[PDB]
């Protein structure tokens, strides 16, 4: 017979690019990277404003159904 | 006589490369490796974007029916 | 007289190398060793991709009918 | 008179080294010791690949008819 | 003759999607998930707010009468 | 003469694939696996969502009348 | 027949938004959050003053009778 | 029926603004933030003299019975 | 004829909501829940302060004479 | 007839608020929580000085004869 | 009838303020606080010389017979 | 009746000022205080030569039998 | 007539306070309490040095002839 | 009549202070406390050199024949 | 009668000062305290060369037959 | 009788001065102290070339059979 | 008359010190104590190399014919 | 009469020093001690290379026929 | 009679120097020591390239048949 | 008999020089050594470009079948 773990396209619409996961991961950096100027106060946490769209593209387009 | 544990080719189409297992294991890294910037915020969990296709190839092509 | 526990060659074709046992033991590692990155996320469970063919050879070739 | 419990050489050809007992005791370890990696996944049940031929030699060569 | 274990459509209306089981499995997570901030107080038990509708769809739509 | 234990085809229509047994074995997992997130709250009881259709196919298609 | 697990609207008025669950989950945070300034004394446990109303809205509005 | 988790207004008069919680959270800062002049002796632990009345207002006035 | 197992309404007034069974089941939790803070001392046995009135309503209103 | 499990008001005066149960459950916390400063020596077991009067009120005033 | 768990005033004279419990808890801090200056030797375990008389007053004067 | 936890005056003469506890806590400071001039070699551990008689007086004279 | 189960006052002088039962129950605690420091070695079995005289008073003075 | 459980003074001379019980309990601490420096090697099991004479006095002098 | 737990003076000559216990407790410190210079390499485990004769004198000379 | 823990003089010739323990404790210092010049490169680990013979003389010459 | 249960001195020569019971009880410890280093591998079962001759001396010399 | 449990000297030649027991206990340490360098990788299980000949000498030379 | 646990020289040829045990213990260090340069990247796990031939010689040449 | 742990030359061709282990250990350094110029940016991790071929030669040529 065939497989039974899929056939619904439910997990693809939940954990994907056009879903809600991309919104909860973009606000976690500004929650701590924009308030750490108290103790440190140094130009350090600035290389993460471009790796968000790159990590989501090299992991979602691996299989693609 | 012959064997009775197979002869249906059901588990091969369920736990394989062209199935649904490769999709449930590709989104588990972005679920935790992309949200751990709140506590650590360091370049560490970045070597897992290439070992996914390697581990699935060295285990599925062992017997191959 | 002779023995009566064998004379059919049924268990040899069921629990052997050229059967279905080698397939149910190769997918059990990827089912749990490839999804435990949510809690651990460490290079640890990687020494099992070579002990599968070794353990099956040191046990099946002991008697050999 | 003599004894009447033997004189047939039936149990010696059934429960011995050159019989079918040595085949049913070698597949019981790989049936569960090779699939218990789902819960434990540790190096524990590995000292049993040498005690099979030792236990069968210290019990069969005791009397020897 | 036919079967006698069914023919009433009683267990389908009790253990299903349009019943009361989906309401008891949705409050059990927040009952111990929203109050465990005393000892733990971390971001770990957040991946269960999307697997509720996925597990119920890969189990109820298997047979479907 | 012939046999008298069959000839009615009653147990085949009751304990089979196209009967009511396949419906009572699919809801027993969600009754306890979906509510065990209180004490455990882990990813362990997630492999039973594919072995339901596999065990029923390696047991019913053994004889087949 | 119909189901017998509901028909009383008792668990809905006990575990919901307009009940007492929303009050016991808001005091547990300040009970350990406003007193942990003796050991750590940092800015880390400050993101929980907005996720209280978000987690209760992505869980109660799932089924809704 | 209704709910049984409240209807006494006991926890509201104990863990609130006009209770005793506001008195135990104001002396914990001076117990350690004012005696750290021995090893550190710097102007650092001075931002907690205004966040006490703010954190107690954004958490107590969320529901308000 | 009719039945002879009822017609007295004796067990209904003894094992019911407006009887004495609801009183012997409400003091059994405080007898063991308020004393288990010695060896364990953990917030765990707190989910039983609402399931008492629910379990007594989903079992008594099933038949109702 | 009526019920026979009550009619004496004996268990109400023994396991209640104005009895001796409230005196035994108040000394069990100080017997072990005030002496555990040997191994732990931390501010953790301090939230139980207010939940004693709350748990006894949400369980005794449920039925009330 | 009345209660039978009290009426002797035995536990009150044993576990109280004017008993021996206040003496076994006042010397427990000096047994471990005055000796931890070897490995640590830091101003840390100094907030316990005032919470002894406070914890014994907020628990004994709760009921008071 | 009276109490049974005391009536011997044994723990008072063992853990007190006129006992042997004051001698084991006065030599433990110089055991690591006079030899820490290797790695540190700074004026730091010098304020502990006056807090020995103060901490023993504010803890022993609390109850005083 | 009267009763014939008493009238001798024999069991009262054997199983009572002023008998030998109070002596066989006071040494059984130290028999296992003073020797359990081998494997455990913890302050745990110390709450039984006061409940001996309490349990014997709330059980013997119940009837009192 | 009188009691028959005593009248011999045998258990008093066996399980008492002037017997052999005080000798078997004084060497149990040095058997495990003086050898646990191999793995732990810390000042922890040192509060037992004074509780030996105290526990034997608060249990033997309770009744005293 | 007298006691029967002693009268042989066997445990006194085995677990004492002039026995073999004092020899097995002096080599355990040098077995690990003298080889821990690999990872630690710090003056720490040096206060144990004087507490050996002190602990054995406050334990063996307690009763002394 | 006499003791049974000794009477062989085996542990004295194994863990002593004229044995093999003095040879394993002398190479562990040069194995890590003479190679730490990579990161540190400072005169610090040089006070251990005289405490080897001192620690073995204050431990072996304590009892001496 | 006299007794008939003795007068043969048979059980005394079989279950005694100068018999064979003392040999079967001394090898049972090394059979399980020298092999438990596989799973546990800890210093725990070492207190039995001295209690063998003590238990046999407090049991055989009780009556002594 | 004499004893009947011995007189064959069979268990002495099987469970002794000059037998096969000393060989099965010397290879059990290297099977588990030389493989724990994977997860732990520390110097801890190195004290067993001298206690093998000591434990076999203090147990075999106890009686000696 | 003689012993029956040996007489085959099977365990000596399996667990010895000239067998397969020396090969499985020499590759376990490079499997985990040559890959730990990711998280640590320090010269620490380099003392095991000489203790392999030493530990195998001090355990195999103990008895030697 | 002979040994049964080898006789296949499988682990030698898998964990050796002319296999795949030498390739997975050479890319692990450039994965972390070429990217650590962010936080550190110093010439420190440059001693690993020569110890790769040395460590693989001092461990593989130890036995050599
Ligand atoms: C401008 C450098 O930014 P980063 O590379 O993030 O920091 C490196 C050092 O930690 C600077 O102190
Ligand atoms: C100590 C962790 O504090 P957070 O604010 O959780 O994270 C910020 C960076 O990790 C600084 O370390
Ligand atoms: C550079 C890639 O990440 P890692 O190898 O995990 O870095 C080591 C430390 O954890 C960094 O502090
Ligand atoms: C922020 C995500 O954390 P997880 O990887 O789910 O868990 C981490 C460990 O369990 C605790 O360090
Ligand atoms: C390095 C290969 O994996 P393992 O040997 O399982 O690592 C042990 C520790 O858990 C390291 O973190
Ligand atoms: C090859 C060793 O196997 P085991 O001794 O069974 O396992 C090691 C410990 O028990 C850790 O769990
Ligand atoms: C996340 C791993 O899940 P499983 O492998 O199913 O279980 C292994 C342990 O029991 C987890 O604690
Ligand atoms: C006051 C008790 O000790 P801690 O909470 O650890 O103190 C904070 C830091 O240790 C200051 O250095
Ligand atoms: C000086 C202001 O106080 P803080 O922001 O707490 O400290 C910042 C740096 O850590 C100074 O050292
Ligand atoms: C947090 C509420 O209590 P539980 O759900 O019983 O917690 C699970 C573990 O047993 C915690 O120890
Ligand atoms: C510090 C407050 O007490 P608790 O909430 O009991 O502890 C929380 C963490 O476990 C700190 O360790
Ligand atoms: C001056 C007394 O000693 P401390 O207060 O410990 O000094 C603080 C810093 O350690 C100075 O270096
Ligand atoms: C000092 C507390 O003693 P207990 O409550 O008897 O024990 C609690 C834990 O179980 C100790 O591990
Ligand atoms: C004499 C003190 O004994 P303990 O309190 O058992 O040890 C101190 C801490 O527990 C260190 O961990
Ligand atoms: C230096 C004295 O020895 P210890 O008191 O054992 O160590 C104290 C601190 O841990 C030093 O780091
Ligand atoms: C000067 C001798 O060595 P040490 O005393 O270990 O030095 C301590 C500081 O680290 C100096 O650098
Ligand atoms: C030398 C003490 O041995 P034991 O008392 O048997 O064990 C102590 C703990 O159980 C260690 O875990
Ligand atoms: C002397 C090497 O250390 P050990 O005392 O064997 O072990 C200490 C801990 O158990 C490991 O951190
Ligand atoms: C260069 C010494 O290495 P090790 O002795 O393995 O470790 C000791 C310290 O912990 C260095 O970090
Ligand atoms: C140029 C030396 O490099 P390393 O020896 O790796 O480091 C030593 C110091 O810590 C420099 O940072």
Residue numbers in the entry:
A (entry chain 5J), B (entry chain 5K), C (entry chain 5L), D (entry chain 5M), E (entry chain 4L), F (entry chain 4M), ...: 6 to 70
Anything the authors wrote about it?
The infection cycle consists of the following steps: first, the ssRNA phage adsorbs to the side of a retractile pilus via its maturation protein (Mat), presented as a single copy in the virion shell. The capsid of MS2 is composed of a single copy of Mat and 178 coat proteins (89 coat protein dimers) with a T = 3 quasi-icosahedral symmetry. The F-pilus, the receptor for MS2, is a dynamic filament assembled by the F plasmid-encoded type IV secretion system (T4SS), which directs the conjugative transfer of F plasmids. A recent high-resolution cryo-EM structure revealed that the conjugative F-pilus is an assembly of a stoichiometric pilin-phospholipid complex forming a five-start helical filament.
To improve the resolution of the F-pilus, we created a loose mask around the F-pilus and the Mat to locally align the density within this mask. This allowed us to achieve a more uniformly resolved density of the F-pilus/Mat complex at an overall resolution of 6.2 Å. The ɑ-helices in each pilin monomer are clearly resolved, as is the internally buried phospholipid, which interacts with the ɑ2–ɑ3 loop of each F-pilin. We observe that the exposed surface of the β-sheet-rich region (or β-region) in the Mat lies parallel to the axis of the F-pilus and directly interacts with the N- and C-termini of the pilin subunits within the F-pilus in a defined manner, in which the tip of the β-region leans opposite to the N- and C-termini of the F-pilins. The area of the interface between the β-region of the Mat and the pilus is ~1062.89 Å2. At the pilus–Mat interface, residues of opposite charges have electrostatic interactions. The positively charged His357 from the Mat interacts with the Asp7 from one pilin. Two arginine residues, Arg36 and Arg99 from the Mat interact with two aspartic acids, Asp7 and Asp23, from the pilins, respectively. In contrast, in the phage-bound structure, we see extra cryo-EM density extending from the N terminus of one pilin subunit into a hydrophobic pocket (consisting of Val15, Phe31, Leu33, Phe92, and Phe94) on the exposed surface of the Mat. This electron density may correspond to the five N-terminal amino acids of a pilin subunit, which were previously missing due to their flexibility but are now stabilized by the Mat.
